[PDB]
Amino acid sequence: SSGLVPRGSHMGYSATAPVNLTRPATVPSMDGWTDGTGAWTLGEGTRVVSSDALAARAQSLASELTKFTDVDIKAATGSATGKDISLTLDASKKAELGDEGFKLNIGSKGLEVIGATDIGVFYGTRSVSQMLRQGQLTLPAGTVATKPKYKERGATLCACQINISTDWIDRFLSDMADLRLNYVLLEMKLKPEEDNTKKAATWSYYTRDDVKKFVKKANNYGIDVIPEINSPGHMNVWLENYPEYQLADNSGRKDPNKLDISNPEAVKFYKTLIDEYDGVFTTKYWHMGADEYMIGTSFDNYSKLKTFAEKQYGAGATPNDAFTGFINDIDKYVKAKGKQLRIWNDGIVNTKNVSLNKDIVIEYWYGAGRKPQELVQDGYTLMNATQALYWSRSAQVYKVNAARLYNNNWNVGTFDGGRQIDKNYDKLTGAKVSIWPDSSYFQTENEVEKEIFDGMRFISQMTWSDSRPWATWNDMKADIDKIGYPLDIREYDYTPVDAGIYDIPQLKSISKGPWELITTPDGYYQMKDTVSGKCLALFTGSKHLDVVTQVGARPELRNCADVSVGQDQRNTANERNTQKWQIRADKDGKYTISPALTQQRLAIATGNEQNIDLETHRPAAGTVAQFPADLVS
Numbered sequence: 001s002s003g004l005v006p007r008g009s010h011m012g013y014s015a016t017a018p019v020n021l022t023r024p025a026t027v028p029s030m031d032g033w034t035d036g037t038g039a040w041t042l043g044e045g046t047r048v049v050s051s052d053a054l055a056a057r058a059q060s061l062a063s064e065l066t067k068f069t070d071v072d073i074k075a076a077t078g079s080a081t082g083k084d085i086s087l088t089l090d091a092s093k094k095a096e097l098g099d100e101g102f103k104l105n106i107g108s109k110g111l112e113v114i115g116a117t118d119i120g121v122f123y124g125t126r127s128v129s130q131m132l133r134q135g136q137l138t139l140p141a142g143t144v145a146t147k148p149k150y151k152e153r154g155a156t157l158c159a160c161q162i163n164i165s166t167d168w169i170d171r172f173l174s175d176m177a178d179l180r181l182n183y184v185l186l187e188m189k190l191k192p193e194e195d196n197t198k199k200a201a202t203w204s205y206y207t208r209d210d211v212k213k214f215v216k217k218a219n220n221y222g223i224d225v226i227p228e229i230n231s232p233g234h235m236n237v238w239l240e241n242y243p244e245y246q247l248a249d250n251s252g253r254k255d256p257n258k259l260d261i262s263n264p265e266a267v268k269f270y271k272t273l274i275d276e277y278d279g280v281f282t283t284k285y286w287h288m289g290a291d292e293y294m295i296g297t298s299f300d301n302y303s304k305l306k307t308f309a310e311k312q313y314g315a316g317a318t319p320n321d322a323f324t325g326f327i328n329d330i331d332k333y334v335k336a337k338g339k340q341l342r343i344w345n346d347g348i349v350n351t352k353n354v355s356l357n358k359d360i361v362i363e364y365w366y367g368a369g370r371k372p373q374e375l376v377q378d379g380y381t382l383m384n385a386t387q388a389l390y391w392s393r394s395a396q397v398y399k400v401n402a403a404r405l406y407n408n409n410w411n412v413g414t415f416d417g418g419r420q421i422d423k424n425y426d427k428l429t430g431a432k433v434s435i436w437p438d439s440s441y442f443q444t445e446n447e448v449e450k451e452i453f454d455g456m457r458f459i460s461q462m463t464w465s466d467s468r469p470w471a472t473w474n475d476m477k478a479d480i481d482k483i484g485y486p487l488d489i490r491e492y493d494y495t496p497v498d499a500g501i502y503d504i505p506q507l508k509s510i511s512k513g514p515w516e517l518i519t520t521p522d523g524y525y526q527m528k529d530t531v532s533g534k535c536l537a538l539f540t541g542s543k544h545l546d547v548v549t550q551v552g553a554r555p556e557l558r559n560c561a562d563v564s565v566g567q568d569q570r571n572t573a574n575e576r577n578t579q580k581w582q583i584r585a586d587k588d589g590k591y592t593i594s595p596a597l598t599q600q601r602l603a604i605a606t607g608n609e610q611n612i613d614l615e616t617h618r619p620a621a622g623t624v625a626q627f628p629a630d631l632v633s
């Protein structure tokens with residue numbers, strides 16, 4: 001027989017290690033590792049030791065490692081031994097480590113993590129978690145210091161029109177943290193509550209309490225959550241119930257997507273929303289969008305804006321000057337609140353009388369004038385938001401291809417359309433992937449999470465390390481799958497109840513049941529009515545992005561769709577995904593039932609829920625309907 005037996009090395013340091021023992025990979029890579037003698041092993045008695053000030057980080061790392069490794073790892077203060085992981089914050093190391101970088105020293109004093117800031121220490125703990133959660137508890141000795149090349153590294157998460165659930169957002173922030181990504185542009189509606197804005201409280205929205213909760217989670221992970229309220233285009237979710245602020249074309253036809261920037265009360269409405277957001281986000285930035293104001297049309301059909309431009313910005317001014325003026329006026333407004341403005345690059349165009357303020361960050365997604373190289377010449381600050389890094393649920397042109405970008409030598413100076421700029425440009429802030437819903441029934445948010453996995457590791461690698469230490473994409477892919485997700489995602493209880501047959505009293509207005517529940521690959525349920533043999537769907541009501549957003553919409557029974565197939569089955573997507581339900585357990589133990597695509601919650605309608613949609617249609621009192629969770633708690 002082979003005599004095969006676990007090696008079982010003692011915990012702590014050993015001067016003996018084989019020379020080519022694997023060093024578990026990380027993402028981002030930690031480039032320039034200097035090898036040392038021996039190796040260190042996490043084992044019984046290993047602790048996470050730190051100062052009092054680092055106690056919370058030490059405790060959180062010890063609990064996490066206890067879960068991944070099955071060894072009881074406790075946090076402690078005072079002296080570290082060779083059996084231990086030590087956390088040190090040394091702010092004098094700014095030159096070597098900067099604001100986010102860290103150094104690991106693995107040797108006879110144990111596994112030392114050093115950062116110059118709290119977030120730098122927390123980012124080194126992410127590499128310690130990644131290295132120890134891959135089935136190997138012995139790490140080769142040596143040392144490495146690493147810091148990100150670019151200051152802003154992350155994603156656009158567009159939680160606009162449709163709702164991305166807060167549980168999804170919380171997983172996404174844990175994943176960003178794991179990959180050292182520090183930037184999320186969250187385009188989203190914070191529920192407007194004032195008399196003058198409250199008729200825009202249509203769904204999707206997020207409550208102030210929920211925003212404060214995920215902003216606090218983000219900030220503990222070193223993530224800047226930047227709100228966007230896109231303007232003066234893509235304003236349907238805000239202007240639908242405010243036609244007084246909508247821009248009319250020369251024939252008098254109003255577009256709920258366009259703010260009338262010539263109407264000072266419409267501009268004041270936008271600023272009022274900025275002041276509403278100010279109390280729940282902590283960032284120093286405001287993103288006002290500014291893409292695609294005249295998509296589907298042209299300024300020639302809005303002569304009122306040329307008249308306005310001439311009055312406001314002098315004879316010869318054009319609608320593009322009025323458009324840029326509006327952005328500069330919002331820049332003035334947010335700067336007075338201590339923020340810096342950011343916009344998308346596309347509407348920045350050809351001005352005469354007005355020039356765009358240089359203190360506005362330009363997030364460049366669309367090779368549309370200027371070219372990147374022109375904007376560099378003018379000294380603008382630029383973030384690379386190339387369409388090569390887009391995903392959309394419906395627009396199959398936008399699916400990140402990480403293999404292609406890794407193998408074709410894309411880097412953060414490769415702007416949209418392969419327009420290369422110097423990747424060392426001193427005002428290149430970094431780069432981001434962008435996650436857009438578009439027609440939103442083709443993919444559930446859980447399928448979006450499965451799909452973006454590789455592209456999120458790709459952007460993390462190229463914005464921190466800017467290197468390709470894996471010979472090909474497929475070599476990186478093998479390591480990122482071994483590294484896996486961070487603990488919070490592995491612990492999320494996607495399907496808290498077993499498949500089986502259930503009584504569900506909340507559904508009696510639809511059927512007396514009982515109901516057969518089965519689970520789907522993406523973490524939801526189909527609910528079949530054993531009386532009719534049909535399945536519960538949330539299928540009908542007013543929609544945005546082809547998803548029912550109507551507050552008070554009622555579910556219905558429809559012929560059972562096949563919920564076991566993947567997102568490539570696009571021809572049956574809508575029947576299939578309108579039949580998926582997310583069940584969640586309360587703190588503690590009551591269950592709520594949500595349509596997977598809408599992320600509202602089923603409830604029995606009382607007639608006392610207050611919402612602009614309900615001013616004009618209410619479900620019959622006592623029937624089961626969906627409502628935002630805040631109207632039904």
Ligand SMILES: CC(=O)N[C@@H]1[C@@H](O[C@@H]2O[C@H](CO)[C@H](O)[C@H](O)[C@H]2O)[C@H](O)[C@@H](CO)O[C@H]1O
Pocket residue numbers: 158160161187230234291292344365390391392395398436437438439
């Ligand atoms: C900057 C940008 O990519 N603009 C377009 C995106 O438009 C956004 O669409 C969403 C809903 O999906 C919101 O309405 C948002 O306000 C708009 O900015 C579009 O999603 C993406 C990907 O298809 O490409 C652009 O056309």
